[PDB]
C-alpha cells in the first residue's frame, strides 16, 4: 500500500511474527525508517528461551537492560505479502512493548520512501 | 526522489536548516517515519537562545533534559524543493547534536512509504 505520514498518526502495520519459540501472533507494529534493526515484545517468547545481553543508543540515552537480542531468526508475515520476512536477528523489548519495523525487514519488503 | 532502505545504510539527506537566530546552515540528518517531530542540533543555535524545556520518550529511556523545544518557527530546505518547510515547532538535541527529519516536515514534503 502506500502508507501516508502524518505526525498526528503513527504509520502501522499488522505483522504475524513468528519467534520459534512459541505460537506466531499478530501484532500492531510501528513502520520505523529509523530503525537499524526489528524490534519485537518479550511477550512473544517463551519464558525460558535463551536472549543475549545488548546495549542500545537511543533518544532517551544509552541502556544496557531493556532490550536483549534473539537466538534463533523470527519469521515475519506482512497480510499483502505471500513471502515470509527472514531475520537473522532483532532486538526484544524486555519492557515497553514496542514492536517496530525497522530496515532489515523493510528492505526484504522491498519498501521505500518517497518524497516527489 | 525514491530512497531505498537498507539496515547498513542510514537514509539521510542534506537540508538547508534556518532557525531565525542566525544565518542557514547545512546539516545531514537521517529521515524516520517513527518520528512524530523533527530534532535539529543545538549548535545551529548561539549560546544565548530562549527555549523551552520539554519531556521526550525514545528507546533510550524517557529524559526531561536532552531536548528542548524552538521558540520560533524553523525553516527547513531542501535539495529537491523550492518552497521552505515552515515547523511551528520542533526538538532540539542539546546532548548529542543528532539531526531527524520526521513525520510533521515529511507530511509538508508530501513523504510516503510505499510497500509494493
Ligand atoms: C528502535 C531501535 C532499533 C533503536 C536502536 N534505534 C532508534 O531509536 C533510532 N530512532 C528511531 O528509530 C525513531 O524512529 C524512534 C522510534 C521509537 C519511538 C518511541 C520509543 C522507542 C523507539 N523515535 C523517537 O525516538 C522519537 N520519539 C517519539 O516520536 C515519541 N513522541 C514517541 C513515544 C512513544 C511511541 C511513538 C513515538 C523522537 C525523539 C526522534 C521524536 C531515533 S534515534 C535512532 C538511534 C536513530
Same mark, same amino acid.
Given at each position: 500500500?502506500?502508507?501516508?505520514? %502524518?505526525?498526528?498518526? $503513527?504509520? !502501522?502495520?499488522?505483522?504475524?511474527?513468528?519467534?520459534? =519459540?512459541? &505460537?506466531?501472533? =499478530?501484532?500492531?507494529?510501528?513502520?520505523?525508517?529509523? /530503525?537499524?534493526? *526489528?524490534?519485537?515484545?518479550?511477550?512473544? #517468547?517463551?519464558?525460558? *528461551? @535463551?536472549?543475549?545481553? *545488548?546495549? !542500545?543508543?537511543? /533518544?532517551?540515552?544509552?541502556?544496557? %537492560? &531493556? #532490550?536483549?537480542? =534473539?537466538?534463533? @531468526?523470527?519469521?515475519? $508475515?506482512? @497480510? #499483502? $505479502?505471500?513471502?515470509?520476512?527472514?531475520? *537473522?536477528? +532483532?532486538?526484544? %523489548? =524486555?519492557?515497553?512493548?514496542?514492536?517496530?519495523?525497522? $530496515? %532489515? /525487514?523493510?528492505?526484504? +519488503?522491498?519498501? !521505500?520512501?518517497?518524497? @516527489?
Amino acid at each position: 500500500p502506500v502508507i501516508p505520514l %502524518d505526525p498526528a498518526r $503513527r504509520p !502501522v502495520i499488522k505483522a504475524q511474527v513468528d519467534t520459534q =519459540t512459541s &505460537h506466531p501472533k =499478530t501484532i500492531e507494529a510501528l513502520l520505523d525508517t529509523g /530503525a537499524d534493526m *526489528t524490534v519485537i515484545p518479550i511477550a512473544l #517468547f517463551s519464558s525460558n *528461551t @535463551p536472549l543475549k545481553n *545488548t546495549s !542500545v543508543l537511543g /533518544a532517551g540515552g544509552q541502556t544496557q %537492560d &531493556h #532490550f536483549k537480542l =534473539t537466538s534463533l @531468526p523470527v519469521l515475519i $508475515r506482512l @497480510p #499483502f $505479502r505471500t513471502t515470509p520476512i527472514v531475520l *537473522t536477528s +532483532c532486538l526484544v %523489548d =524486555t519492557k515497553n512493548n514496542w514492536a517496530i519495523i525497522g $530496515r %532489515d /525487514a523493510l528492505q526484504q +519488503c522491498q519498501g !521505500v520512501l518517497y518524497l @516527489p
